[PDB]
Amino acid sequence: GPAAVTVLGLGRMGSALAAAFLAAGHSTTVWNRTPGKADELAARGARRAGSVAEAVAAAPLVVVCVADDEAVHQLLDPLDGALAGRTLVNLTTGTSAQARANAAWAKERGAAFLDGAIMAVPEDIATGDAVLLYSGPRDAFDAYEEALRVLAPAGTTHLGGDAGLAALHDLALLGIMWGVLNGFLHGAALLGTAGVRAGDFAPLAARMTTVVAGYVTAAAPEVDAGSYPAGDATLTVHQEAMRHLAEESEALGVNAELPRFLQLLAGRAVAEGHAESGYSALVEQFRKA
Amino acid sequence: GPAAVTVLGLGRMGSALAAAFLAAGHSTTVWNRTPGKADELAARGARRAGSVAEAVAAAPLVVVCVADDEAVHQLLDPLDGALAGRTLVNLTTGTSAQARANAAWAKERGAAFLDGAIMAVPEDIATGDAVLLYSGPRDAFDAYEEALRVLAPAGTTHLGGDAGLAALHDLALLGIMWGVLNGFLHGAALLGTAGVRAGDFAPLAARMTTVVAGYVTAAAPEVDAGSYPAGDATLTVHQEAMRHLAEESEALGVNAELPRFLQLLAGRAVAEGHAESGYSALVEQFRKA
Ligand SMILES: NC(=O)c1ccc[n+]([C@@H]2O[C@H](COP(=O)([O-])OP(=O)(O)OC[C@H]3O[C@@H](n4cnc5c(N)ncnc54)[C@H](OP(=O)(O)O)[C@@H]3O)[C@@H](O)[C@H]2O)c1
Ligand SMILES: NC(=O)c1ccc[n+]([C@@H]2O[C@H](COP(=O)([O-])OP(=O)(O)OC[C@H]3O[C@@H](n4cnc5c(N)ncnc54)[C@H](OP(=O)(O)O)[C@@H]3O)[C@@H](O)[C@H]2O)c1
């Protein structure tokens, strides 16, 4: 049947995690530092643990979702041997270095450790819009995927054994989001000088975004190969259009810092001999500090 | 019946335009500065004009596709009485300023003017994959829509009456492309430090991209209303994640200039008083030089 699970942390997001486990039929034990945040869950069937030690002893799967890594260790460091044989899933926001250090710490204490990144707001937990990324030993993920997937039934993803991968993928994916939104908003500013409503630009911008998803998968093998054929446009052609975008921005009185930055990066690739390479050659500029 | 059409310029793209008109059954007159580029078009029924003047006299719809605005200028400027009653469609890459000047110039010579932006490679002309954006007086677009759509049968769009709109839309849409691709390549660099192959990141990055296409249309009403509710994250929350991405880049030895620039832009918005606004508030600083 459903695995027993413990949730440590009943903030907005921890509470949503515990509610999802309970609604899916798991025996759910909950704990929070400050009393008074567990009684609705208890009334729905959760076990209100009397202490951290009881909570951690209650289930082989311990999901932690608190403010930061300092709080995680305030809760878990005083435990003496309680973690041995258990699987710790840390959904607290942290860095890749914190996750890798936590993996070593947990291994010393006999626990399996998965670091997770929640790509969702609390209200979207257990919906098809949620994504949760996991990293750490695959055997622990496989053992508990049936339980963990109730938090993101169409979005539960194991990335690999390096515990730092979740944090890094989360940030990398947000980078794509910021790139899209900046392009939309800068474009909306540019077109706004000609009276164009952002809602008139948006369907074209959204379709472009969808099209460029295919460019992403097309570029990946070139990155891995270190070989960057021009395909449909050399970096020279890209850079010229970048220059044009900057010059139109300056002429029309909107901010040109974004296209000038794009042009800077492309120019560094051209300076290293990639005038006739495809856009994927810019990966070499991103690897260099 | 299919309108007679003239194509000026038989480079890689002009040749594809002429071929498409011919295949669709239009009487097609062609001209190129250098002879010997129209043999196959002529075998297919193209009428080879001996001069620009003869070409413009042959058909009321004149499609121009040469290297740049200087070339368009050298072809058009000697024409006076020849242009009366014609509709000039300029598919040459150029600036919004040049397009607006060309519209006014043509109108004083008795000719209608549409500026166009080809978002396609030559081999995709006359396929469902092609996109062609047009701008200029709508009466001319409507008069020749049946002819023009042969070039992009599922992707022809008239943007508005301002002749400069096509150039601006093309560049704004490319800005979105560069945003996605830089986000992907920076992410690939960052994850590369952990041994992640770009092809293993790519499915996640592409899924992200297709999801964020929906964020674009969600943001448009906020831009048009000048109202920027936080939604799922205030600018403070965005900026903190941006800083995290920069710090991970720095600590892992890859380039951090992109996340630091993202941080700069978001901080520009926060300094205007938008700490608690949503991301669409960034449009305001994109409007400011
Ligand atoms: N949209 C989101 O909310 C979202 C999305 C993705 C990830 N996350 C992550 O989820 C984690 C929790 O966020 P949240 O929204 O639930 O935050 P929250 O509503 O502020 O709750 C924070 C939780 O951390 C606990 N905590 C703080 N300091 C502690 C300590 N020293 N010892 C023990 N517990 C401590 C709090 O306990 P008390 O009740 O005793 O204060 C509470 O359970 C964060 O790392 C957050 O970044 C949140
Ligand atoms: N993928 C693409 O190719 C693509 C995509 C979108 C837009 N475009 C745009 O389409 C336009 C043409 O590109 P293309 O690929 O066809 O370039 P191309 O193969 O280099 O052909 C350039 C054409 O311009 C003509 N030309 C140049 N200077 C001239 C002048 N001073 N007087 C008369 N004719 C002149 C050339 O005539 P000669 O043969 O006599 O040299 C030739 O017909 C450009 O503005 C380009 O940016 C191209």
Residue numbers in the entry:
A (entry chain A), B (entry chain B): 10 to 298
Paste lines from the article.
Since imine reductases (IREDs) were reported to catalyze the reductive amination reactions, they became particularly attractive for producing chiral amines. However, the industrial application of IREDs is mainly restricted by limited substrate scope, especially low activities towards bulky amines. Phylogenetic and bioinformatic analysis suggested the IREDs IR-G02 (Streptomyces albidoflavus), IR-21 (Saccharothrix espanaensis), and IR-35 (Allokutzneria albata) were all derived from actinomycetes and belonged to the same evolutionary branch with sequence identity ranging from 40 to 44%. IR-G02 shows an excellent substrate scope, which is applied to synthesize over 135 amine molecules as well as a range of APIs’ substructures.
Each of the monomers was made up of an N-terminal Rossman domain and a C-terminal helical bundle connected by a long inter-domain α-helix. Except for the NADPH binding site, the pocket cavity of IR-G02 showed a strong negative electrostatic surface potential, which may favor the entry of positively charged amine donors and imine intermediate, and contribute to its high substrate promiscuity. Superimposition of apo-IR-G02 and IR-G02-NADP+ complex shows an overall rmsd of 2.665 Å. There are substantial changes in the Rossman fold: most secondary structures shift with the binding of NADP+, and the side chain of T102 flips with its hydroxy group facing the NADP+ and forming a hydrogen bond with the ribose moiety of NADP+. The homologous site of the residue S260 in IR-G36 is occupied by A242 in IR-G02 and no interaction is found between the loop 234–244 and NADP+, indicating IR-G02 is “wide” type IRED which possesses relative wide catalytic cavity for bulky-substrate entry and product release. Cavity-volume calculation using CASTp30 suggested the cavity volume of IR-G02-NADP+ (Supplementary Method 3) complex is 1.9-fold of that of AspRedAm, which also rationalizes its better substrate tolerance. Protein structure analysis suggested that T102 was located at the Rossmann fold domain with its side chain approximately 2.8–3.0 Å from the 2′ and 3′-ribose hydroxyls of NADPH, which is responsible for recognizing and binding NADPH. Analysis of the IR-G02-NADP+ complex suggested the side chain of H247 is positioned approximately 11.9 Å from the NADPH C4 atom that delivers and accepts hydride, whereas the distance from W187 to NADPH C4 atom is 12.8 Å. Tunnel analysis using Caver41 suggested D241 is located at the flexible loop A234-L244 on the top of the active site, which forms a bottleneck (about 3.6 Å) imposing steric constraints for the entrance of the bulky substrates.
